[PDB]
Amino acid sequence: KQYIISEELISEGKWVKLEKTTYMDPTGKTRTWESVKRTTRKEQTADGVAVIPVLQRTLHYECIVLVKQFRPPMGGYCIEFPAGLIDDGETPEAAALRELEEETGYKGDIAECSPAVCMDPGLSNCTIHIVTVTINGDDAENARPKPKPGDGEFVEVISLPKNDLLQRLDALVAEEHLTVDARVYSYALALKHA
Amino acid sequence: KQYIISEELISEGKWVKLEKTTYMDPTGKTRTWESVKRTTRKEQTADGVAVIPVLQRTLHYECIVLVKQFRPPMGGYCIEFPAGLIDDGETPEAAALRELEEETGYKGDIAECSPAVCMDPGLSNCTIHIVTVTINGDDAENARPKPKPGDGEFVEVISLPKNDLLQRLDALVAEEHLTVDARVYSYALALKHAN
Ligand SMILES: Nc1nccc(C(F)(F)F)n1
Ligand SMILES: Nc1nccc(C(F)(F)F)n1
Ligand SMILES: [Cl-]
Ligand SMILES: [Mg+2]
Ligand SMILES: [Mg+2]
Ligand SMILES: [Mg+2]
Ligand SMILES: [Mg+2]
């Protein structure tokens, strides 16, 4: 019923552009929208990956491995699933295992890979694959994991028990000025609601 | 240890602006970022709310109520939690019950309310409150739900059983060429991962 008529570039930076979107509404009336897109999206099924990294260890509760980083858009520290953009020609699964190792030091095993899902579809066309990865924390490879951050990457690893994730996030938010990512919080809420 | 030095306006629309953010990296090196902000936020706790609506009917599976809408930035239809921007002087809780009624016609009760959570913090400063709302589907006011959508809103309601949410969302994507919202998919995943 509804479809795009035109996409007019307003402003294009190195990383992000703003567009004037013209579309047909279901009454048959022309309307416009302000649309954000990234400049980095090539022939990928999505902009990026976020990794749901389930750290498994004999005689430990499963942990969810999270990262804390300064996010210039937010003007502050954010707690998020390990995540990055998919390199040209890179599979979502390879991107997920690569970003997880670079940001946390852990070497994961793929469990599942979502279709492309939308980050903020009233604002942007940005998409990710959410890749579930298990980490064998009994493997020597995953003993003393050292992050290998790229240039301008400054990442702290926070591993929280799956069985108490929402309360543990709440206790981190109570103790410091930091924002939890909406996907992490949605995931922690569902663990509670299950 | 890191902080904003300055923000340079690049482009300001009616709804969205693009800024060049200058920040101090942990080493003392000065760095720039391209940052998106909405123009609509004021004294608000957050830009918006997203409602997790648990529809509870006796002798029925518990359902999560979702909405399907054309999303101009996506150039397509998306499946999402009911959601909208918070009105100036509106509480996140009141925004949640209002948006849920306008988008779905259901009248629900606040179960819990998240702190402000970020939407895409590598790109934008956009935040929402995630508001868990229960709907007593057996009440008369939720018998024939009357959606009251504002100007230029066109919303299909899709109720999916909570206990099979992820498999049900995967099926919609396979038949219907839709995009599932990342928060919806994250919730559905954790329902399967809990056990
Ligand atoms: N980004 C954007 N563009 C046009 C209209 C809107 C509004 F839904 F919030 F009104 N947002
Ligand atoms: N929005 C934005 N600004 C600067 C650099 C980036 C990058 F992560 F994609 F590299 N993004
Ligand atoms: Cl609930
Ligand atoms: Mg990253
Ligand atoms: Mg990275
Ligand atoms: Mg609305
Ligand atoms: Mg809405």
What's CA B131's distance to the chain center, in Å?
9
Tokens describing residue B19 = 């800024």
Q: Cα separation of A118 and A129, whole Å? A: 9
Cα Dmax for chain A: 62
Measured by CA distance, the residue closest to atom 4 of ligand 2 is B33
Token pair 């991107």 in the structure block, residue: A95
Interface of A with B in 27-66 (CB under 8 A): 31, 33-38, 50, 52, 54
Cα B96 to Cα A116: distance, rounded to the nearest angstrom:
27
Q: Which residue has the tokens 């020609």?
A: A89
Interface of A with B in 153-182 (CB under 8 A): 154, 162, 173, 179-182
Q: Do residues A49 and A92 make contact, with C-beta atoms less than 8 angstroms apart?
A: yes
Q: How many angstroms is the resolution?
A: 1.7
Distance A132 CA to ligand 6 centre (A): 31
**Residue A44 near residue A88, CB atoms below 8 Å:** yes
At B13, list the tokens.
């629309």
Q: Whose CA is nearest to atom 11 of ligand 1?
A: B15
Those residues whose C-beta lies under 8 Å from the C-beta of residue A150, and which sit 6 or more positions away, are A102
Please name the residues in contact with A180: beta carbons below 8 A apart, sequence gap of 6 or more.
A78, A79, A169, A172, A173, A188, B114, B115, B117, B118
Enumerate the residues of chain A whose CB falls inside 8 A of the CB of residue B191.
Answer: 190, 193-194
Asked whether A92 and A80 are in contact (CB, 8 A), the reply is no
d(Cα A115, Cα B36) in Å, to the nearest integer?
A: 25
Three-class SS of B158-191: EEEEHHHHHHHHHHHHHHHCCEEEHHHHHHHHHH
Phi-psi region of B89 (alpha: psi -120 to 50; beta: other; left: phi over 0): left
Protein residue with its CA nearest to atom 10 in ligand 2: A15
Question: Among residues B64, B184, B63, B47, which one has the least CA distance to residue A117?
Answer: B184
Could you list the residues of B known to form a binding site for substrate, using ranges. Answer: 15, 33-34, 38, 71, 85, 120
Q: Which of A80, A81, A130 is nearest to A110 (CA)?
A: A130
In the annotated binding site of B for Mg(2+), the residues are 83, 99, 103, 153
Residue A24: strand pairing partners? A3, A30
The single-letter DSSP state of residue B97 is: H
Q: How was this structure determined?
A: X-ray
Residue A49, CA distances (Å) to A21, A99, A114, A134 in order: 26, 8, 10, 15
DSSP string, A107-120: --EEEEEPPPEES-
Q: Do A186 and B191 touch (CB under 8 A)?
A: no
Q: What is the 3-state secondary structure (H, E, C) of A50-81?
A: EEEEEEECCCCCCEEEEEEEEEHHHCEEEEEC
DSSP string, B68-87: EEEETTTTEEEEE--EEEPP
Nearest CA among B80, B86, B121 for reference residue B104: B80
Buried b / exposed e across B106-141, counting CB within 10 Å, b at 16+?
A: bbbebeebbbbbbbbbbbbbbbbbbbbbebbbeeee
Range of the domain at B30: 1-195
**B161 Cα–ligand 3 center, Å:** 13
Q: Distance between CA B50 and CA B131 in Å, rounded?
A: 6
Domain count, chain A: 1
| Residue of A1, A4, A51, A50 lying closest to A27 (CA atoms) | A1
Q: Please tell me if residue B150 touches chain A, with a CB cutoff of 8 Å.
A: no
Q: Which residue has the tokens 């990234």?
A: A38
Supply φ then ψ for residue A36, to 5 degrees.
-95, 135
Question: Which amino acid is residue A81, in one-letter code?
Answer: F
Q: CA nearest B114: which of A34, A166, A142, A44? A: A166
Alpha helix segments (H runs only) across chain A: 92-104, 165-175, 182-193
For residue A175, the CA-to-ligand 3 centroid distance in Å is: 26
Q: Tell me the C-alpha to C-alpha distance, in Å, between residue B151 and each of A19, A94, B125, B158.
A: 22, 44, 26, 21
Cα separation, A85 vs B169, whole angstroms: 24
What Rg, from alpha-carbon coordinates, does chain A have? 19
Question: What are residue A174's DSSP bridge partners?
Answer: none
Structure tokens, B147? 């959606």
CB A37 within 8 Å of CB A19: yes
Residue A123 Cα: closest atom of ligand 1 = 1
Backbone dihedral angles phi then psi of residue A156, each to the nearest 5 degrees: -105, 135
Residue B110 DSSP one-character state: E
Q: Which helix (H) or strand (E) holds B102?
A: helix B92-104
**A93 phi/psi in degrees, rounded to 5:** -60, -50
d(CA B39, CA B15): 5
B13 lines ligand 1 (CB under 6 A): no
Does the CB of A113 have a partner CB in chain B at under 8 Å? no
Give the CATH number for residue B115.
3.90.79.10
